[PDB]
Amino acid sequence: MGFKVKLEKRRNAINTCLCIGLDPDEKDIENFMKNEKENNYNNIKKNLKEKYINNVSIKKDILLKAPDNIEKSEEFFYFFNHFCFYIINETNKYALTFKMNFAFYIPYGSVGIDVLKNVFDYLYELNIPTILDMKINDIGNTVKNYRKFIFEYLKSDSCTVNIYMGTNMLKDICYDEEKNKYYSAFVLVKTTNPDSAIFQKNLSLDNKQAYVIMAQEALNMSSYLNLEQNNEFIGFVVGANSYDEMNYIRTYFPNCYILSPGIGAQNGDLHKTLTNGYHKSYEKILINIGRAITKNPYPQKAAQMYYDQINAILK
């Protein structure tokens, strides 16, 4: 159940340290519909056969109601949801973990959160580890709501956090006193955008860069609260492009957990001190590929490809 261990069993059961990213945007949804409606809803039908589609708890009465609209108020809700069910049913067998970015589930209103819950409900019935990338941040009082929403409502296994506002965040995010329970988190160390770090790098304390002070601070916080046992942990978000830095964290923080995005789209080099710099028992270095798989004409295949070339561990 604990992350470390849930992530350990599944690693064996399938190897690979791939993390499929499920960030469906507005066009992913209209295309899946545009050419699903004009194909007799074959994929949605394939889904509807699944079975595990029954933990899902929001508008179950609409979700499992054979392909139809009227275009009813629930049209959009339908399809969006199914597009997600579709990807999962065809990619999970290659995934060690699924990572959903909250951001894409909120621009249309509550309808998108409903879907988020059904997705997390789904990934949860299959026993697939999850990551809600929302990189939360706020004051202890407030942060407590993100901890509830994330680990209590969605039953997620972990989530990303931005501790710039202060590292004590984690004590309210990774630990719930009222009921004990410990959770896992991923702190933002080095991100994947070009103007990336004139902060994570140009900034420093005694000439030790900011992403190191931050990386070090985050770890000393998981020492207190003793996550490591309890079967949880606090890891880092280190971009695929940040080759130099990746190799440094893996050396100074050798048994650490890493979540690295940026490959497949966002430009990338799977190999190269990425899956090498950061190597370890692979599940300690999750590679995330979203669009490269989710935007490809016929995925699973893409998945498989990544699985395979990721399975190329000459180590």
Binding residues, by number, are 23, 99, 101, 133, 135, 138, 142, 192, 266, 290-291
**Of 35-43, 46-54, 89-97, 188-196, which part binds its own copies (CB under 8 A)?**
188-196
Distance of CA 174 to the CA centre of its chain: 16
Residues 242-271 that bind ligand OMP (CB under 6 A): 261-262, 264-266
- Asked if 47 and 86 touch (Cβ cutoff 8 Å), the reply is yes
Q: Which is it for strands 204-205 and 208-209: parallel, antiparallel or unpaired?
A: antiparallel
Inter-helix orientation angle 42-49/77-91, to 10°? 70
- How many binding residues for its own copies (CB under 8 A)? 56
**Is 283 an interacting residue with respect to ligand OMP (CB under 6 A)?**
no
β-strand partners of 237: 188, 259
In the complex, minimum distance from the CB of residue 303 to ligand OMP, in angstroms, rounded to a whole number: 12
Choose, by CB under 6 A, the member of 156, 191, 200, 230 that binds ligand OMP. 191
Choose, by CB under 8 A, the member of 35, 42, 69, 110 that binds its own copies. 110
Residue whose CB is less far from ligand OMP, 21 or 129: 21
Q: Which residues are annotated as a binding site for UMP?
A: 23, 99, 101, 133, 135, 138, 142, 192, 266, 290-291
Q: Which of 305, 250, 304 is nearest to 282 (CA)?
A: 250
Choose, by CB under 8 A, the member of 17, 131, 174, 197 that binds its own copies. 197
**Rounded Cα gap, residues 165 and 145, in angstroms:** 16
Choose, by CB under 8 A, the member of 55, 196, 276, 304 that binds its own copies. 196
As to burial, measured by CB atoms within 10 angstroms (0-12 exposed, 13-18 middle, 19+ buried), residue 1 is exposed
Residue whose CB is less far from its own copies, 173 or 310: 173
Nearest 5°: the CA angle 45, 48, 50 is: 115
Choose, by CB under 8 A, the member of 158, 200, 294, 300 that binds its own copies. 200
Residue whose CB is less far from ligand OMP, 147 or 230: 147
Residue whose CB is less far from ligand OMP, 89 or 160: 160
In the complex, minimum distance from the CB of residue 60 to its own copies, in angstroms, rounded to a whole number: 14
> Which residues lie closer than 8 Å to 282 by C-beta, 6 or more apart?
11, 15, 16, 17, 313
- Asked if 294 and 87 touch (Cβ cutoff 8 Å), the reply is yes
**Is 118 an interacting residue with respect to its own copies (CB under 8 A)?**
no
**Is 137 an interacting residue with respect to ligand OMP (CB under 6 A)?**
no
Nearest 5°: the CA angle 288, 52, 10 is: 40
**Rounded Cα gap, residues 283 and 210, in angstroms:** 26
**Rounded Cα gap, residues 242 and 285, in angstroms:** 14
x/- mask, ligand OMP, residues 156-175, rule CB under 6 A, reads ----x---------------
**String of DSSP letters for 43-105:** HHHHHHHSSGGGT--SSHHHHTS-S-----TTTTHHHHHHHHHHHHHHHGGG-SEEEEEGGGG
**Of 7-15, 73-81, 143-151, 290-298, which part binds ligand OMP (CB under 6 A)?**
290-298
Name which of ligand OMP, its own copies, none residue 199 binds, using a CB cut-off of 5 to 8 Å depending on partner kind. its own copies
Name which of its own copies, ligand OMP, none residue 284 binds, using a CB cut-off of 5 to 8 Å depending on partner kind. none
**Rounded Cα gap, residues 96 and 160, in angstroms:** 17
**Rounded Cα gap, residues 299 and 292, in angstroms:** 9
Contacting residues toward ligand OMP, per CB under 6 A: 21, 23, 101, 133, 135, 138-139, 142, 160, 191-192, 237, 239, 261-262, 264-266, 288-292
